Amino acid sequence: MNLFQTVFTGSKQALAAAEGIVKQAVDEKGRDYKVAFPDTAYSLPVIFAATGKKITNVGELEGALDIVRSLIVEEEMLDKLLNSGLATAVAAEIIEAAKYVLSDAPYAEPCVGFISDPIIRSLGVPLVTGDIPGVAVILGECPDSETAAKIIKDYQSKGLLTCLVGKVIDQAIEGKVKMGLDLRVIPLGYDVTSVIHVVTIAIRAALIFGGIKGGQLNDILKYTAERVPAFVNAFGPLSELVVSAGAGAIALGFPVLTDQVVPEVPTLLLTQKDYDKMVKTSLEARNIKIKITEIPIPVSFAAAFEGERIRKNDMLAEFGGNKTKAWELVMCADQGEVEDHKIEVIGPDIDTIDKAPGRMPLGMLIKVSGTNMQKDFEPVLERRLHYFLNYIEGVMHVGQRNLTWVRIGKEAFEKGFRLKHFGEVIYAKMLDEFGSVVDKCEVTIITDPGKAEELEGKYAVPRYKERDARLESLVDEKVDTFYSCNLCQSFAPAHVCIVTPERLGLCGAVSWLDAKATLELNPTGPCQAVPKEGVVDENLGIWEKVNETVSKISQGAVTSVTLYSILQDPMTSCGCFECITGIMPEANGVVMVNREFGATTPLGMTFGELASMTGGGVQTPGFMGHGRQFIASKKFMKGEGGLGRIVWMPKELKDFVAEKLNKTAKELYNIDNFADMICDETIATESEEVVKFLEEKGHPALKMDPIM
Amino acid sequence: KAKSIDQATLQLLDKAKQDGVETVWDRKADMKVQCGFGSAGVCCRNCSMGPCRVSPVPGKGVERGICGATADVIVSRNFARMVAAGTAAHSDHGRSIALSLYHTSKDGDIKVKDENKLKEVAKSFNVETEGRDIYDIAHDVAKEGLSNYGKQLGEVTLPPSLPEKRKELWRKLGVYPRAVDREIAAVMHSTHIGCNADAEAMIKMSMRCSLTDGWMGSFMGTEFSDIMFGTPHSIDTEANLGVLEKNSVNVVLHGHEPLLSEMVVEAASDPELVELAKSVGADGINLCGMCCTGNEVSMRHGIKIAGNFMQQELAVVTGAVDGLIVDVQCIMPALAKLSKSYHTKFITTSPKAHITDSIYMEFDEENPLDSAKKILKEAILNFKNRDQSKVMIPELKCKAILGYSVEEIINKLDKVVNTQIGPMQTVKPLADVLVSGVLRGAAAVVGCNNPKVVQDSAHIETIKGLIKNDVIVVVTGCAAQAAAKYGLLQKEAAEKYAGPGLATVCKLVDIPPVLHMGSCVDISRILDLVGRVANLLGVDMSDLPVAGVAPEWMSEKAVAIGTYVVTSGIDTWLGVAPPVTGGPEVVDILTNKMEDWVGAKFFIETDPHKAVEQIVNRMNEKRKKLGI
Ligand code: SF4
Ligand code: SF4
Ligand code: SF4
Ligand code: NI
Description:
The structure is cut from a larger assembly and holds chains A and B. By secondary structure, chain A is an alpha/beta fold. In chain A, 36% of the residues lie in helices and 16% in strands.
């Protein structure tokens, strides 16, 4: 049986299994029973991508078997083989969809099954910023548990997102691999069809970030081949179904690597028996590049350990919190004041503890020097300090400035981790991440209570005050140069951000100062200067140079952009906005929802459904994606009347932005704790009830001019 | 019917009609209905008791010649003599190359330009290379190659790419080759009156003779040419008659021997000759090549290709050819007569190829560069006799990419090799795409033009059909030049003509769907390639989904080529019927029984679309046999 016949045989078996499980759903639930995946806006993504049709009931699921049949043409030509691979992918999705119909919870821990849309958008940024070099789809079984654990942890230590299908899930558990979405080790399921759950991640990436409409299958296949850096490692004996599923991965442009003897196809299907070189073979086959990090600490330092969890039973000592106040500060000084590679520790070390999880004050004073180092770069360094400290195994860092929290686990301590290794990590990452400006870096870790008390008020508090003052002193009128971030163009070619003092990047990780620091550090980076000349309308937020820049960067996809409006040529979003705001014409205002919120909205749509209406780099009036810091902005919907249009917000988001929103709404002379007027899901969620609440509460939206 | 599918050819045919000169098409028309006996191969003239003609229809008319020879005997002897003549042409070419290799020196006109290739060849000839002078090695290699032509004791030397299974099959069949000239002499002896009167034995002798062409003569000629003049690599060129320049001296190199054309190319950069071209009122020197010598200089230097066999006369019809320099083979003698109607100097250079009423300037191999310089100076001085009012150069030229030697193909295949897997510098990626079925097979398109077929029509149709069916095509000779003129030798052609699997392969490897592997002797390269693939897969060459096609062949060399390709285990399609239809036993041997002997056989198909269909079906049959 040659390659073509193996793939055709596998697709027929996939079709046979899909027909059998659909018959069970019809007999048990009927053709009128609803068919859906948990928390998705694209129905069944593979069928929606291939045909544009949304499948909602069981009767339509049975009619989707004809899609599988039409994709299996048994002629030995490459196009038919790729179509047959897509037939297996469609059949696998139908099988997985029928699982949720038959069982309310078809997947138990540790398997996650289907991956919701908010999770995909959460990992959308890491993908664009390169935080995630690629996606390792590992399925099958390795010869032993340690071999699987070594390969999986090798991918994990390199920052790749690895997905597991089959017995490698159990082998990795025996190998003590830390699994989780935040640990970038996702077990999908023990059945081969569970590999469709990572396929739909790539498919929805084209739908979400690429802005490709459903039914444009070739554009979606082209997108996944160029944009999604996924590859398959198939271990253990491969059945015909596994090979046919691999042809589906090849159809999406994902190369398939295996330890089995197969009819190899160059750059697409490769055999690598040497398990010690499988990771390197896959990175070359998928053109994935990872920068090598060197750190003199006896612990594993990877980005995937940012989500590590340490139980209180096995915690060595904790700093910060309400136990003993701790602080962190990055300050710039003269060349002679800081000498390179001086990690001094003041006070007791971490090994002097002789008890249960101990309380000890902490202080991290970081002194960097350089010719191009100014006071404005300190916030960026201190912000990345949190990520630097959280990448160490056995170390969790929470908070910022003097409201920080550091915990060291016993696992890291038993490996020789001490307090000077904090300085080692900080020094290495400061000279590595910010080598353009940070010529020298002297880091001192303080555990003496008196020294921590006296240096916190002498060096840190005044700088916190000056940073807050500088942040409060920045408005769009004060500045004379905006910045444009095109980092997200790796997945949304038509999307260009314009970060202003009063409007940060919709991802929430790029601010005006962050953009200004990225431009200074990397003049060829995504952030570039955009002068605010050629003003057309200050109320709606229009500048001629901004339009010129957006046309140039987006290659003419977007010609006109307004920065302070939601209904006239709004700035595009891609997929990464923390919150999304949509107009509510019945309430004469706008509703808002964050990504973490997973309930309904007065518009009748969840966050995923709402967000599937304004992404991909397409100008969509009425729906705007933005960060949480843009909610309480004087330029938030300035053209449409400002903050008065906010009529419904989630309670968690309302509590997050209450103080800032009240302070900004005080300009409308609504001195009423304006956050109280806005409805929330704990008060009312349907349009009738929220409108009644607005009428009773005297909301400014009802008294304003019509928004549409 | 139309004379050609090429528009430049048609414009020049109109001009030739206006000028009152006759072409090969006109002479073909004048020949009218050709003799049926000779067309069927049932005419014999091997002794002066004849001429004898027997009926091409068994059971009717005269059955035997005067000596008693049957139609099958007459047909088999005629076929064998065609094979012997083709083998002689190729072997004489290779012999000249081997002698040139023997006369190489560090400070001479002929040097060694590819030392690595020479060392590999020396390994193949059991010549020591470590700690030795490169020219001592070259002379030893040339001695071994020359011994392949005329050794009377011992076994000949064959390339390592030839599978052991094929050698053993040849030995069991009785066709294992001897020295090349010895096999030619044996074939000529057995066709003498009153010798071999058994068709099966006659065909086997012809196969044995053709093997000395494919694996010894052509192979050694190609490899020694690579050693002396450089291994071809990917290179751009232009093709068709539009490459001629009105305002420059136009020197057209026609023939097969590469040493003369190499020396002419070198002489064209001589400062004195460039100054002389300027002084006669020309912008410069424009060298253009035709047929196989054009293929050689184009593969190695990017010299523009003016045209293939049936275009040679039309090159003169433009009125822009100042000098037409010819060595041997496929040089229409009518050129001499045609040259009287224009200013063109028609220069013969080889003692083997005197042509009446041409200007004879013997190419001196003792001083090749000076001899080439004086010949080129005659061509340049003829520019003063140009009549610009008679000049018409059609503005039809086409970009082409060529230079795909086996080494160049392996270098290209190295791109799609994962570094962590390997190995490098093998044909393994090609074997992988063939085994997986992404490529259905590989087909060699070779051969001449023939007035019996609309010129270049069969070549182009066969090539387009094959690449549309995900069959990668390698081309040589006049077929390669037809592909170049048409525009198939382009990377863009992959997305314009190829099927899905071949288009993907071309994109991944960055090659055209059609690979120009050189001249007619460079068909040995094809053998080499196939052999390597077979040796990588541990099978004989008859187990692979490969084929050869000669859509428009005319020459005895083409007959010998097809015979040794079939004998090597590669099915061959002939687009022009050979004169064998009069002998039913010979037809049955060539098209049916041959498969029992060597695992391949001839296919006679004059319809190119049907030929493509048959090739695809046969390749699928062999794939199903092989399990892929
Ligand atoms: S500023 Fe815009 S382009 Fe840059 S990361 Fe944020 S959303 Fe993406
Ligand atoms: S092939 Fe024979 S019979 Fe025919 S014309 Fe020639 S000599 Fe005469
Ligand atoms: S060899 Fe025989 S058949 Fe041929 S010409 Fe002589 S007598 Fe006739
Ligand atoms: Ni986005």
